[PDB]
Design an enzyme around this catalytic site. Structure first.
Site, mmCIF file in Angstrom:
data_model
loop_
_atom_site.group_PDB
_atom_site.id
_atom_site.type_symbol
_atom_site.label_atom_id
_atom_site.label_comp_id
_atom_site.label_asym_id
_atom_site.label_seq_id
_atom_site.Cartn_x
_atom_site.Cartn_y
_atom_site.Cartn_z
ATOM 1 N N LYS A 78 -38.754 48.963 -10.055
ATOM 2 C CA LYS A 78 -37.710 49.862 -9.579
ATOM 3 C C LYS A 78 -36.657 50.114 -10.657
ATOM 4 O O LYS A 78 -35.902 51.083 -10.577
ATOM 5 C CB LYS A 78 -37.058 49.305 -8.309
ATOM 6 C CG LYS A 78 -37.974 49.356 -7.084
ATOM 7 C CD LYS A 78 -37.253 48.932 -5.817
ATOM 8 C CE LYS A 78 -38.088 49.220 -4.578
ATOM 9 N NZ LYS A 78 -39.366 48.453 -4.555
ATOM 10 N N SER A 119 -41.706 45.128 -7.237
ATOM 11 C CA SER A 119 -40.411 45.783 -7.095
ATOM 12 C C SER A 119 -39.527 45.653 -8.329
ATOM 13 O O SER A 119 -38.479 46.307 -8.379
ATOM 14 C CB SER A 119 -39.670 45.228 -5.878
ATOM 15 O OG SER A 119 -40.299 45.627 -4.671
ATOM 16 N N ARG A 152 -36.719 31.960 -6.009
ATOM 17 C CA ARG A 152 -36.653 32.768 -7.222
ATOM 18 C C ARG A 152 -35.274 32.670 -7.862
ATOM 19 O O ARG A 152 -35.151 32.403 -9.063
ATOM 20 C CB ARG A 152 -37.001 34.221 -6.899
ATOM 21 C CG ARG A 152 -38.407 34.407 -6.348
ATOM 22 C CD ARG A 152 -38.640 35.833 -5.884
ATOM 23 N NE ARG A 152 -37.715 36.227 -4.824
ATOM 24 C CZ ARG A 152 -37.681 37.435 -4.272
ATOM 25 N NH1 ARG A 152 -38.523 38.378 -4.676
ATOM 26 N NH2 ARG A 152 -36.805 37.703 -3.312
ATOM 27 N N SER A 184 -34.674 46.685 -1.976
ATOM 28 C CA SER A 184 -36.036 46.908 -2.461
ATOM 29 C C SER A 184 -36.804 47.852 -1.537
ATOM 30 O O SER A 184 -37.886 47.538 -1.039
ATOM 31 C CB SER A 184 -36.778 45.578 -2.612
ATOM 32 O OG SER A 184 -36.159 44.751 -3.578
HETATM 33 O O1 LIG Z 1 -37.845 40.686 -2.802
HETATM 34 C C1 LIG Z 1 -38.381 41.784 -3.089
HETATM 35 O O2 LIG Z 1 -38.285 42.351 -4.202
HETATM 36 C C2 LIG Z 1 -39.203 42.464 -2.021
HETATM 37 C C3 LIG Z 1 -39.663 43.762 -2.201
HETATM 38 C C4 LIG Z 1 -40.428 44.370 -1.223
HETATM 39 C C5 LIG Z 1 -40.743 43.688 -0.059
HETATM 40 C C6 LIG Z 1 -40.297 42.384 0.145
HETATM 41 C C7 LIG Z 1 -40.658 41.632 1.374
HETATM 42 C C8 LIG Z 1 -41.809 41.931 2.094
HETATM 43 C C9 LIG Z 1 -42.131 41.196 3.218
HETATM 44 C C10 LIG Z 1 -41.288 40.176 3.599
HETATM 45 N N1 LIG Z 1 -40.171 39.860 2.936
HETATM 46 C C11 LIG Z 1 -39.878 40.585 1.850
HETATM 47 C C12 LIG Z 1 -39.521 41.789 -0.848
#
Ligand SMILES: O=C(O)c1cccc(-c2cccnc2)c1
Ligand SMILES: O=C(O)c1cccc(-c2cccnc2)c1
Ligand SMILES: [Cl-]
Lengths: 241, 241
Positions: A49, A46, A226, A94
């Protein structure tokens, strides 16, 4: 470049492993806990993006940050995705499906030419046009993230100044009387090793520090680390109070 | 418009007197604790740095948000004014002498010209070109502040989109996972009545609330109440957590 192995404690204490890379713009000097992993290439997930937004805005695929992209009516596991979004909220949460439609409208040819134009990662979009940044052949390192983000900050990318201002607005994550952070998180799971990203910069009165971190993420339970680990490196180096 | 006198408690608690005006963009409805003082026109003081920045940017007096404006070497009572600034920091610290130089280069005619185009307050710049917003004839009410801010948010002012995007960046005050505030403080001391301003908007996922508040400020000790009282109203209305 200077290597600071004392920072490994910040990852060790949470039974984790990863890399944080800092760049002092005023002094043009960098810092990392692990020169090796700082130059190892991972899926951007992500974090893609950012360039995806830049390309979609410059091509007119996205008119502005107010254009609404309606939910397709397909229920997905992440609740915040099951609603309408604009650019600001689509990046805050996201929202993969919104950006997959972007990619499908941008198309293979224009996406490839722009990523080479950005000098982004390995510039390889091999895979499916609507998921290659999730399970395709594209790869990027932490140090390479910083090089791309530095150009974005200076409006040096080969898209309009307007496109870069909108995306940087969309990147706004945190702001107070002491500093401003503009960044994007990432979470790569479709290809091993599973990792999480956080890349961006911190704006001060008289300087900007660019940062890019990635860390092992065997479970979604550790995603909060993070930002947590990054800010601690910033506090230690006296960048933020 | 709808009057909500229950907000008066937030002023009474701190032995203060003032008004807060809110505008719900989605519903095109306004709310205030005092309909009369909401339409009362005061000197804008440092809230004027919003229109002033727009003019300086559109006329080329200011190139961009990185251009440095040197300290002139005059020691002034406010320490943060005795240093170099850019547009971002000049507004963060309400640096009057930087914006007086802007006005002098803008000139009497172009300033009057632009404020008429903005429909800003009573559009009266009588006084010194570089202090009329401090001790001149310009007057603007809280409701008029919001009307002007609404045009800025929608890029509907008669200056370039670029200028309006930059000023909205410089107005950045606070941002977290729940809201973003873009606003500007004011403090009128040279002519009675002494008051303090805070005007702007709070951006949410699915809506935007514009706000404009002013209060009596006999002494500088109470300046912090401008943000505190506003947020207590925002919390009561469940706009921010
Ligand atoms: O933190 C992110 O960038 C992100 C992006 C896409 C999906 C997810 C996500 C996917 C499944 C569970 N928790 C978070 C996080
Ligand atoms: O807070 C403000 O908006 C502001 C603007 C200009 C000057 C001052 C000020 C004036 C005198 C003492 N301390 C602060 C405050
Ligand atoms: Cl911004």
């Amino acid at each position: 470049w200077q290597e600071n192995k004392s920072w490994n404690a910040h990852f060790t204490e949470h039974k984790s492993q990863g890399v944080v890379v800092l760049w002092n713009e005023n002094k043009q000097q960098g810092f990392t806990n692990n020169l090796k992993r700082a130059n190892q290439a991972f899926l951007p997930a992500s974090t893609f993006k950012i360039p995806n937004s830049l390309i979609a805005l410059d091509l007119g695929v996205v008119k502005d940050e107010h254009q609404v992209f309606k939910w397709d009516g397909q229920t997905r596991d992440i609740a915040t995705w099951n609603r309408d979004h604009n650019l600001i909220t689509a990046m805050k949460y996201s929202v993969v499906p919104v950006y997959q439609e972007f990619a499908r409208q941008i198309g293979e040819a224009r996406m490839s030419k722009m990523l080479h134009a950005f000098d982004y990662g390995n510039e390889d979009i091999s895979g499916n046009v609507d998921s290659f940044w999730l399970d395709g052949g594209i790869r990027i390192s932490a140090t390479e993230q910083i090089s791309f983000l530095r150009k974005l900050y200076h409006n040096k990318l080969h898209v309009s100044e307007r496109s870069q201002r909108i995306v940087k607005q969309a990147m706004l994550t945190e702001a107070n009387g002491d500093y401003i952070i503009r960044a994007k998180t990432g979470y790569s799971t479709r290809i091993e090793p599973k990792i999480g990203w956080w890349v961006g910069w911190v704006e001060l009165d008289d300087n900007v520090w660019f940062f890019a971190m990635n860390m092992d993420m065997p479970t979604s339970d550790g995603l909060g680390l993070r930002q947590a680990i990054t800010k601690e490196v910033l506090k230690q180096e006296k960048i933020i109070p």
